[PDB]
Design a protein around this ligand. Structure first.
Ligand SMILES: [Zn+2]
Ligand SMILES: [Zn+2]
Ligand SMILES: [Zn+2]
Ligand SMILES: [Zn+2]
Ligand SMILES: [Zn+2]
Ligand SMILES: [Zn+2]
Lengths: 370, 370, 370
């Protein structure tokens, strides 16, 4: 969808209505922790709005230029195993960005950093809104410097007519109750979000592609903006329950993937053009390394980069992973020292590592995170 | 496919061959009721032919302009639940039109209205033929006022060379026998039709898209017109067995959806621009309402409109639904009375309500159907 | 991918690296038969390279003009049953060409014809490489006389930077060990290859379609060429194990399909324009015939044509099929005798019939193969 850097536009309308929806549908029986966390979120509405529009205007989204249109099966295809060369990091998808930003928001909320938690939650909802956008051509025709297309600017002009204020039921029944059933957030999210995204692709073909009339486009905007608002209210309800009840979604499960979220210092020359690798060592002395490389320019000064790693040994638990590190390898003969500010490592929806570094890494060097 | 308003063209050839196929393959052991109903259908061939081409030339198909090309997974995506905002009616698909017109044909046949039953059966086969048409671009390039494209007009010129006169086996064996196995018509139809539609999408990419040669196009027309004729013969065989044996496909199952087929009187000003809602009330006093809104202009004078409703409570049987109604809500301050001629409600492949109304509904009023 | 008729280019690089990969990853425990067959393959590298590029420059690929881009679900859709008119032969797909050429290579290797076996194996890998090529528009824009597109010529210029030399593990662990688990080669191949092809379609939409930048294209070439090389090393490892251990993948299973690979003599006028049919007769006297017809010109002088037949009776074993034949039917009144040189029939991954003919077939005649 469209949105503006000041926290206005379609994206901000969707998360604003998501909270309004929950306030209207919130059952009388919901626990007081959930009701109290909803009021903290309401206090931080402006951050939720900024978060919701930010990803289209971030720099780190690899110089470029933004395109937030994926085939709905991308995430599923990338999860398969066999079909990915394991030494390469997996690219970000709208599906994986929802999970990463969700894990970050839960982590921040729990340590009492509500401003930052809500900004991250907004960013998760941005990507959910994008995967529900009914636009799936092979070749994109962008009309602005932030990578939006005409269907989104058309909906933007008309956004106020598509607002909804209830999902049709209270949070003790059907839609909302089914969202709490699966404890594994990542597993739930993958299936839940995929349903909305596939319906958006069907609607692209039947009503929103460029050959369709303006009436069809208006209809496509109405139904997909109502699906966006409903799906968004569902994520927010799930979020409130997870942080109120102190749910850990990672509890017990194998570690198939690890996600690194790396913040490079804003200091002049802190970025690097050398090869960077992430590595682990398990309890039984087996190791795995990965290349950290996304399409654009990785590890630029002041960037926040995301790398997703697929494990070869699928039977591991988080507690089996004893050590982790980052390793630099010189690309040229000329020094290009690297200064990370902080690294967060996420496994099954939990931030398991949050380490401030703020040290220069030079030459061919291995920096131990743990 | 192409077709003409007088019951000629590719569509009419497909249903004509569908009956010819069944006459050739009809086993010696088929019951006399099936054989007798086949002769009544043969007597009404002209209606089957008109029905088969009519939907491209109907008005109510929302002013417009017609496009009968859907992604094969549309129906499946729309059935999911979670991914549809329940207050909105679901849009018609080629898949859902086959089920609606099939239910109407069975209903009419059983009350001895063979002309009308066969016209409805033709209309069901029109939509099956369309979903088997190998044309699935994101953007459609229509070449006539009825929304046809060049692949269909190319096949139209060559239609007589693609005719088949047998599916390769008798109705006591394989293809035909498997069609009778599943008693739930709607469930069978969904899976059966989807196989032909997906094969049509594969063939679109390998042989029928515009970059392919004329030889490839001819091959695509040959195989997909033979699949259309075979699939059509199968539906007709299933129809003959269902009406001969007095099968009820709705028997026992939960009501997940309700379909309203509304005929608005042809009387001047009978149509309306006010908001229209459909509603039910179950045995335990729980209610649900839906907005009736399709992309074009709903409830126009003399129109026959179709609305598909998704139930929130998935455990209901037909006999649990005690009352149903339609409710009007004024859009402007100026009167715009509405006059329906008849409403048919369909649940799991059965016409459960068939009520003649022919009364003016005004103001903000609730009209009880039952 | 691109490639040249002299056994150079991207395709040849992929199969060359596939062997290099296996040499690096080959476990110390692999049996000496596997190690010895790898050295015979290394001796025949030039044939593996020629095989890998040949299919883009063959004539029989039906005059035309080549297009090796399929939707990933094509093979799966064609296997369904119900959705194919059984009297017509099924068209070739990248998926089915991998299976056909694999069966031919295994057959040749076993009779000691290593040159020809390795050339066939190359041809199987050509088609695997194509289905892993991330290019899936509805309409193709070819830029050379062999049907290549700009994404492939762009990767061709840069091919040397994308080479990999290991899959990341030894052949005693994970990736490689899972490849030997399923004994039914055809079943394994269908699922294995489909994973790579679906990932290629996702990458087409996110990075390789024409609207994406050059950086995105470079990234798409890197990951998909590494997937091609990895998948290719896996097929080659499977091949070495199947021929070393004398595996029969057909053992026990029902015959759902039969594949005919027909070589027409190079003699002047050996080809034919008459209708050609293939037929069988089972132990219980039941027969089935099929039309042999592909989109282009079938049975041209010196051609090697492939026809895939779907059986109606799905419960048959290979030993139930007693007789097979080819039947000619005059198209015109003027003689057009046909001279086949050899017919190979393949069932579940085994060459079950290999008959030299080299006899003229005239008029309306049935030629018994067995
Ligand atoms: Zn957006
Ligand atoms: Zn976006
Ligand atoms: Zn049509
Ligand atoms: Zn139509
Ligand atoms: Zn190629
Ligand atoms: Zn090729």
């Amino acid at each position: 969808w469209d949105g503006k850097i000041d926290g206005t536009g379609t994206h901000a309308m969707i998360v604003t209505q998501g909270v309004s929806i929950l306030e209207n549908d919130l059952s009388k029986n919901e626990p007081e922790s959930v009701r109290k966390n909803l009021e903290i979120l309401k206090e931080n509405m402006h951050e939720l709005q900024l978060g919701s529009t930010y990803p289209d205007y971030d720099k780190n989204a690899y110089d470029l230029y933004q395109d937030h249109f994926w085939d709905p099966d991308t995430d599923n295809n990338f999860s398969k195993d066999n079909s990915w060369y394991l030494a390469y990091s997996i690219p970000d998808t709208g599906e994986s960005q929802i999970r990463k930003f969700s894990a970050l928001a839960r982590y921040e909320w729990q340590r009492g950093n509500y401003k930052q938690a809500t900004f991250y939650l907004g960013e998760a909802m941005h990507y959910f809104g994008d995967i529900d956008t009914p636009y799936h051509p092979a070749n994109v025709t962008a009309v602005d410097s932030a990578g939006h297309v005409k269907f989104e600017t058309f909906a933007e002009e008309r956004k106020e007519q598509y607002k909804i204020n209830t999902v049709g039921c209270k949070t003790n029944e059907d839609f909302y109750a089914d969202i709490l059933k699966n404890k594994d957030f990542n597993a739930w999210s993958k299936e839940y979000a995929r349903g909305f995204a596939k319906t958006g692709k069907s609607i692209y073909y039947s009503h929103a592609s460029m050959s369709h009339s303006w009436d069809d486009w208006d209809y496509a905007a109405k139904v997909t903006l109502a699906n966006s608002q409903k799906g968004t209210a569902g994520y927010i309800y799930r979020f409130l329950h997870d942080v109120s009840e102190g749910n850990d979604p990672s509890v017990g499960k194998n570690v198939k993937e690890l996600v690194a979220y790396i913040s490079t210092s804003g200091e002049k020359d802190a970025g690097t053009d050398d090869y960077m690798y992430f590595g682990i060592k398990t309890k039984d002395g087996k190791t795995q390394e990965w290349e950290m490389d996304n399409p654009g320019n990785d590890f630029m000064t002041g960037s926040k980069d995301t790398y997703t790693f697929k494990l070869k040994d699928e039977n591991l638990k988080i507690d089996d992973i004893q050590n982790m590190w980052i390793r630099k390898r010189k690309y040229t003969a000329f020094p290009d020292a690297y200064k990370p500010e902080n690294i967060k490592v996420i496994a099954n929806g939990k931030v398991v590592v949050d380490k401030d570094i703020n040290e220069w890494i030079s030459g061919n060097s291995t920096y131990n995170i743990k």
